[PDB]
Scaffold this active site. Sequence first.
Site, PDB file in Angstrom:
ATOM      1  N   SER A 191      37.657  47.196  25.033  1.00  8.43           N
ATOM      2  CA  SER A 191      37.360  47.306  26.463  1.00  8.43           C
ATOM      3  C   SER A 191      37.400  45.969  27.217  1.00  8.43           C
ATOM      4  O   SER A 191      37.221  44.902  26.630  1.00  8.43           O
ATOM      5  CB  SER A 191      36.019  48.018  26.680  1.00  8.43           C
ATOM      6  N   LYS A 216      34.878  47.309  20.132  1.00  4.61           N
ATOM      7  CA  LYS A 216      34.885  45.875  20.416  1.00  4.61           C
ATOM      8  C   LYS A 216      34.755  45.714  21.924  1.00  4.61           C
ATOM      9  O   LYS A 216      35.733  45.860  22.654  1.00  4.61           O
ATOM     10  CB  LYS A 216      36.199  45.237  19.950  1.00  4.61           C
ATOM     11  N   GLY A 269      43.395  46.368  28.833  1.00  2.00           N
ATOM     12  CA  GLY A 269      43.557  44.927  28.770  1.00  2.00           C
ATOM     13  C   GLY A 269      44.994  44.535  29.058  1.00  2.00           C
ATOM     14  O   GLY A 269      45.694  45.234  29.787  1.00  2.00           O
ATOM     15  N   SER A 270      45.449  43.429  28.479  1.00  6.95           N
ATOM     16  CA  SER A 270      46.745  42.865  28.849  1.00  6.95           C
ATOM     17  C   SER A 270      47.928  43.617  28.232  1.00  6.95           C
ATOM     18  O   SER A 270      47.816  44.206  27.150  1.00  6.95           O
ATOM     19  CB  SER A 270      46.822  41.390  28.448  1.00  6.95           C
ATOM     20  N   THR A 273      48.884  42.131  24.691  1.00  9.50           N
ATOM     21  CA  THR A 273      48.003  42.534  23.602  1.00  9.50           C
ATOM     22  C   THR A 273      48.251  43.992  23.196  1.00  9.50           C
ATOM     23  O   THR A 273      48.304  44.312  22.005  1.00  9.50           O
ATOM     24  CB  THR A 273      46.523  42.287  23.949  1.00  9.50           C
ATOM     25  N   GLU A 297      45.768  51.079  29.098  1.00 13.88           N
ATOM     26  CA  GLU A 297      45.907  50.783  30.516  1.00 13.88           C
ATOM     27  C   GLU A 297      46.002  49.278  30.626  1.00 13.88           C
ATOM     28  O   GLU A 297      45.136  48.554  30.112  1.00 13.88           O
ATOM     29  CB  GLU A 297      44.729  51.311  31.326  1.00 13.88           C
ATOM     30  N   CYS A 331      42.433  45.965  38.156  1.00 13.22           N
ATOM     31  CA  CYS A 331      43.810  46.324  37.872  1.00 13.22           C
ATOM     32  C   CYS A 331      44.459  47.046  39.041  1.00 13.22           C
ATOM     33  O   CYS A 331      45.679  47.169  39.092  1.00 13.22           O
ATOM     34  CB  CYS A 331      43.879  47.166  36.603  1.00 13.22           C
ATOM     35  N   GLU A 430      50.653  39.297  37.871  1.00 14.43           N
ATOM     36  CA  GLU A 430      49.249  39.631  38.088  1.00 14.43           C
ATOM     37  C   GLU A 430      48.358  38.399  37.924  1.00 14.43           C
ATOM     38  O   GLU A 430      48.314  37.793  36.858  1.00 14.43           O
ATOM     39  CB  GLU A 430      48.808  40.739  37.122  1.00 14.43           C
TER      40      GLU A 430
END
Lengths: 546, 544
Positions: A191, A216, A269-270, A273, A297, A331, A430
Site C-alpha cells: 500500500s 506491507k 504504487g509506482s 515497481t 493501480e 494519483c 507525474e
Amino acid sequence: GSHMLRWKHTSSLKVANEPILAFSQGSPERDALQKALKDLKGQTEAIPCVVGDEEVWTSDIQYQLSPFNHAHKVAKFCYADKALLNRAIDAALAARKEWDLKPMADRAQVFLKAADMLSGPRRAEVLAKTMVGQGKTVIQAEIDAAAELIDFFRFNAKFAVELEGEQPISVPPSTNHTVYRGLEGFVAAISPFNFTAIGGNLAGAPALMGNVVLWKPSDTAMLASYAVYRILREAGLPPNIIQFVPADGPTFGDTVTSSEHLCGINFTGSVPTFKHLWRQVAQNLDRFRTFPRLAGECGGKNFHFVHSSADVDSVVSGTLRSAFEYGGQKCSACSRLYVPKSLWPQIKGRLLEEHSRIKVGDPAEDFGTFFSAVIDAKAFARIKKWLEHARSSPSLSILAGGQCNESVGYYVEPCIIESKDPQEPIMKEEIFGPVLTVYVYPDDKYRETLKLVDSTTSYGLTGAVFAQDKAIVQEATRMLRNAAGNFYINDKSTGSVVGQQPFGGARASGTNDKPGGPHYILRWTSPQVIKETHKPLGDWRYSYMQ
Amino acid sequence: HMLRWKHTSSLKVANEPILAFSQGSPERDALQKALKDLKGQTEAIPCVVGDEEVWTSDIQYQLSPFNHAHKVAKFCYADKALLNRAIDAALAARKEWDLKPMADRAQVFLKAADMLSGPRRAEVLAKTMVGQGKTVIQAEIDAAAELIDFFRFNAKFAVELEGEQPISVPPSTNHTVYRGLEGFVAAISPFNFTAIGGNLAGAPALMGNVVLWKPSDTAMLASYAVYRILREAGLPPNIIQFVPADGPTFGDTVTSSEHLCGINFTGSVPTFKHLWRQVAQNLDRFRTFPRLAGECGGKNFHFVHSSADVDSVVSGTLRSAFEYGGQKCSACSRLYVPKSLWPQIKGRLLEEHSRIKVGDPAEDFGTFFSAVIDAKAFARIKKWLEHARSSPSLSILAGGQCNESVGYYVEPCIIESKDPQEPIMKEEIFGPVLTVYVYPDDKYRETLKLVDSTTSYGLTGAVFAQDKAIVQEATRMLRNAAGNFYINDKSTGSVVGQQPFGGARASGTNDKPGGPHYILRWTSPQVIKETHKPLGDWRYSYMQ
C-alpha cells in the site's frame, strides 16, 4: 432423490455512504480531533511487526517522521526480514482453510464492526494519526481515513454478501451451486503513503473474500496504518489472516514472489515497481501452485480541459482543489490544465488572486491551512528539481509560487507554471507535488488540442472537461474515452467516492479493477461450481446409436 | 444535463435443446445430408483480414481424423507481415465498434445463435464430425448447443451488465461506461471444441474488442464455418480477423505489438506460461497491461465411495473417460474404487468395454467414439500405452490397441495402477486411457487426501456416494481439487449457465466462461461523473 448438499438462503445488506463531518467550531468532532492531535504531540509509537498475535522486532529499525515537522519521529518501526516474512507466510497458510470455510456473512461482520469503530469512537484517532504522520489537513484526513475507509469496508461487505446470491440455473435432475472460494495460497498487499484507506482496502478486500494476506504498509503512513490494523483485530479478525509486515520494498517483493504459495499481489504504487513484481512472478511461474493474480493501480498525469463555454469560477475552484489539495499528492490530482485563449485572461487573473490566499503550514496547529508539507525528503528533492527545471526551461514560466523550504517540514508552495510547449516533459511526467502546468490553446484548435490531451501522456487515470455546451461535452467525452477511467464533467478530477465513482484507469495507470465498485472483489475469489445429480445415470449409450 | 443515459433493458434467454436425432427426425435427415455434402470435399479456406481473402505460400491441410487420406480443408499460415496488417486494420475499426451500443453488438451474436440453431445446425455439426472426428451427439452438444448458449448467455450477461450502475447523489449524476479494452485481443483456440473457438473470439468482440483469432489447425473447417456465420449475422469487417498461423509465430507477433491488450487462450500449460513470459518480457512496450486468460487442462478424478450406485459409476465413467476419445480437459482419467466394490466395477467396465464401437462416426452412427485428432496425438497416446506395458505397477485390463493406417485409431484402454502416485495418475494424456486405483475401504479418508494431493491440476472431479455425511466430508476435502465438482454425475459435459467451467491450480486462471462474470475480463470500465451546479469556494468552512 434427497439433496445431500443443502444451500442456505443468503441475506442482503443495507449500507450507505459515511457522512462527512463539518468540524465546525464547538462541534464534538472538532473537539475530539483537537484532543487526539494533542495526544500525539511529542509522542513516538513503537510499532512492531505482527505475525499471528505475536509482536516481533527485528534489528532493522526505521522511523516515520511528521512531514511538516520532521524533527518529530511519530513512529519507530522495523522491517521484517526474509525469515520473518516466510514465517508469516507459513502461519497465514495454516490459518487459511478455516477462514475460507467461514460463512461470507461472518467474515463481513468483522469489517462492518471495524467500520462502526472508525465511524465513532476511533474516528479522531485515525484522523489525527493521518494528519500528523502523513501531513493531511482535517478535511483530507476525514475524507480518507474515515469516510473512504469506512465506505470500502461497508460497501465491499455488501458486494461480497450479495455475490453469493449470484447462482447458476438448475434443471432436473440436478442442482447447481457456485461456491465463492478464496484464492488458494496467500495474497501480498502493498500500500501507498497517500491514503490511509487504500491500505485498509488492499489488505481488507482480499481478507473479506476468504484470503490470507501479508500486508506491507507504507513506511510514511505507518502510524495510521497500524491503527487500522489494530482496529481490524479488535473487530474480530482472527490471528494469521492479515500479517502486519512492514519491510524493505525489494526484499518484500523478492520474498513473496519466491513462494510457491503466492496467489495474488494487490498493489498501489509506482509503474516501475508494479512491472518489476509482474516480471518476478513471470520469472518464477514454474514454482507456483497456481497462476498468481496481479492487481495494480499505478498513478496518472491528469487533466482539466476547459472549453470557452466553461464556468470560470468552477474552473478556478475545482482546479485549485484538484491540483493542490494534499500538496497534489494524489494519483488523481490535476497537473495539466488546458485553457482556451479567449478565457485565459479571466482564468489567469482569478487563479493568481486565489493563489495568493492559499495558506501552507502546520495542519494540526492551524486549521486555516489549505495544505501542508509533502511527504518526505525524497519527494521534496524531486519536486525541487522540477521547480528548477521550470526556471531553466525557456518554454516554461513560473506564474505563481516556486518556493520551497525543508528546514522544519518538507514545505513546497503551490506552483503554477505556463508551458508554451504542450509536449514539454513537465506535461508528461507525474510529479506528485503541488505543481500545476497550464497550456493555452487557440480557441479554433480545440479539437486538435483534445487529441493532444489524449495522446500526450502514457496515463489513463482521471480527467475533467469544463464546458456548458452540450455538443462539445458529447464530442470531448467521445474523444477522451480512453484518456481517463474516472472522467468528470464540470467537476474536479479528484475525490472519487466509494459506490459513486469506482476508481481506476488503464493505459499505464494499472489493471483497472475499480476498487469502490461492485466487481473489485471478484479478483479475490476463484469460484467453484458444484453439480449434484439426484437420479441414477442411465446407459452409456445414446438412443440415436441404436 | 449535458449527458443523457438511455435506460438499459434485460434479455431473456434459455438453453438450446439437445436434439435426439431419432430415425426419421428432421435433424437426423438434415445431418445425413450435410455429411454427404462433405464426403470427398476439400474446402480452400483463406485467411480473412477485413473482407479480404488472403493466401500465403505457407499451405497447410486439415485431415479427417478417422480417414486421414481425406483432406477436409486446405488453408494457410499468416506470416508476421500479414498478422501485423491484421492488427493495424483491426485497430482502425475498434473505436467505432466500441462506441456501438452493447445491445447492437449483442444482436449480431443473437442472430448467429439463431442461424446455428436452425438453418446452419447440420453444417456446423457435420464439419465438426468430419474435421474433428466427433460423433453426432458430441458434435451436437458442442457446435450447436454449447456455441449457441455461449452466444445467447454472454449477450444476456453483457446487456444486463450495463444495468450495473453506481449511486448518484445530487447535484451529480454517475454512470459507468463498460469500455472495450484499448488495443487488440489475441484469441487462441483448441481443436477439441468448436464452441470454444467461437467463445474465445466472440466474447471479447461482444464487449467492444477487436480480435485476431488463430483457430486450431485441426478444427479449421468448423471454425471457418462459425466465422462466416458471424460475418453473415452482421459482424463488421476487421472486428474478428481469421488468421490461422504457426503457433510460435503467432505468439511472437502478437506479444511484440505495443497494442496487445489481451490473450484469450485455451491449450497447454507450457504454451500459456510461454505467452505469459513473453508479455512480461515486453511490458515496457505495451500501451497498457495485457490481460491473460487461460484454460490449461486437468487430470480429473472420479472418486467412488462404497455406498455408490455402481451402474451410475460405470456409465458415467465410461462416458467421461472415453467420449470424444477422452479429448476433453474435463475427462476422467483417474478412477478411485474401494476394494469392496472393485469386483463389480471391474467386471462391468470390462464387459461394457467389449461393446464399445470405435469407427467412422459419419458412416456408422453406432460409433461410441472415433479416431483421435492427429498424428501427434496418436504418437503421444501410444507412448503412454507403451509405458503402461512397461511399468510393473500398471496392468492393462482392457484395450491397449492402436492403428494409424487409415485413421488415428486408439481403442479405449482401462489400466489398473497399484501405485496411486504413478506418472500415469498425474500427467494429462488427452486420449481414451483410464487408470484405476483400488483402495481399502477403511482408508477412504486417506485416499480422499491422495485425490487432492497427487496432481498439479484443479479442473474437474466427481464423487459417487449415497451417504450424506460422506458427501459433505468429501465436498469439504476436495474444495480446491476441482473447479467443477460433481456429486453422482460424470466429470464432463458442463452446460453454459448451469455449470460455468474452469479451475485453478495448474488448470488456468479460472475466469469461468459459461458464467456471468467471464465478460468482465474483456471490459475496462470508465465512470463518468457529471455535476449539474457550479462548484463553490475552494476553501472549506472548518478553515474559517
